[PDB]
């Protein structure tokens, strides 16, 4: 029989609009979200132009309100120049994103003093999330401690990183983290199939011991989040391949397969794709919204899923069990067995809902 799930939330997607709309756009990316059982997305700021100032945020808001099919919030991006400038618009964003390592990003902050300046100037009650790999996780945690506030670590991929976060949580430090499906379901073993172009992602694919360590430390993982990072196959297979994988349409099917194999419970899944995203990012509930899944249907991931403009997937050939049958978003059928039924522009900026503002002391 079907199982009804609440509206799932992905706090880490790249929708590529503005400036990279051949890779994705709000319409195609949120179509891919609905097809993956996702009714609310938080979109990263590494677009063209990047969302690193009030005018770029206003532009992206309209673009999102016109093209998004599911609901959304938009990240602001930290830059080497905008610390202390974001106070009037900070509350309207999903949170502040820091790029602390090299990746598909023009926003790297090279001095730790720039990190501190952001942690000090960004309103302390609003989320800060970091792309922070290996020792950079410990470095950014230190900055959070010096500035006495929380931090959220994006796509944790390594035994090294999850064990460090585990030690920090055991000392009572306010740190949360997310893990992406490719770091749970792929590894070095797959680089031969993928090749060095397709296989290019940051954080890179881990060893089998990295993958095993994340599964063993499920209790340390607060959120699953796709880091949906679409690029075209041409780009992935070209001279300088940009890192990243598309993932909205495969994330939930992969995770449902793990559930059916007894590797985690349905509750563990709902904690990490609904409750914890809500509470870490202060995201509002979605009225009359739910996802119906079929845990019985077995299928094989094809060479590309229907909706993402990436038109490729590193999970090709994996056998999954579990499929999104229907999604209702705020009282409308949004998706059924491969058909997206709400138009571009149906989706709304949740930070403009009364319940979607982050509460704060006057
Ligand atoms: O972390 C990321 N890697 C690659 C990307 F294209 C992107 O948007 N984000
Ligand atoms: Zn990243
Ligand atoms: Zn990302």
Author numbering: 1460 to 1821
Task: List sentences from the manuscript.
DHOase catalyzes the cyclization of N-carbamoyl-L-aspartate (CA-asp) to L-dihydroorotate (DHO) in the third step of de novo pyrimidine biosynthesis. In mammals, DHOase is a part of a single trifunctional polypeptide of 240 kDa, namely carbamoyl phosphate synthetase (CPSase)/aspartate transcarbamoylase (ATCase)/DHOase protein (CAD), that selfassembles into a hexamer of 1.5 MDa. Almost all of these enzymes contain a similar binuclear metal center consisting of four His, one Asp, and one post-translational carbamylated Lys (Kcx) residue. A further structural study of EcDHOase indicated that a flexible, dynamic loop is extended towards the active site or moved away from the active site when CA-asp is either bound to (loop-in mode) or moved away from the active site (loop-out mode).
For the huDHOase–5-FU complex, the crystals were grown in 0.1 M MES, 1.6 M potassium sodium tartrate tetrahydrate, and 200 μM of 5-FU at pH 6.5. In order to investigate the binding mode, we solved the complexed crystal structure with 5-FU at a 1.97 Å resolution. The two metal ions and the R1475, N1505, T1562, R1661, D1686, H1690, and G1703 residues were involved in 5-FU binding. Similar to the malate binding, 5-FU can bind to huDHOase via the loop-in mode. When compared with apo-huDHOase, the dynamic loop in the huDHOase–5-FU complex was shifted by a distance of 10.2 Å and an angle of 40.4o for 5-FU binding. Even though 5-FU is a nonsubstrate ligand for huDHOase, the flexible loop still did not move away from the active site. Additionally, R1661 and G1703 in huDHOase also interacted with 5-FU through water-molecule-mediated hydrogen bonding. As determined through the titration curve, the Kd value of huDHOase bound to 5-FU was 91.2 ± 1.7 μM. The Kd values of T1562A and R1475A bound to 5-FU were reduced to 146.5 ± 2.1 and 161.5 ± 1.6 μM, respectively. Mutational and structural analyses indicated that the 5-FU binding mode of huDHOase differed from ScDHOase and PaDHPase.
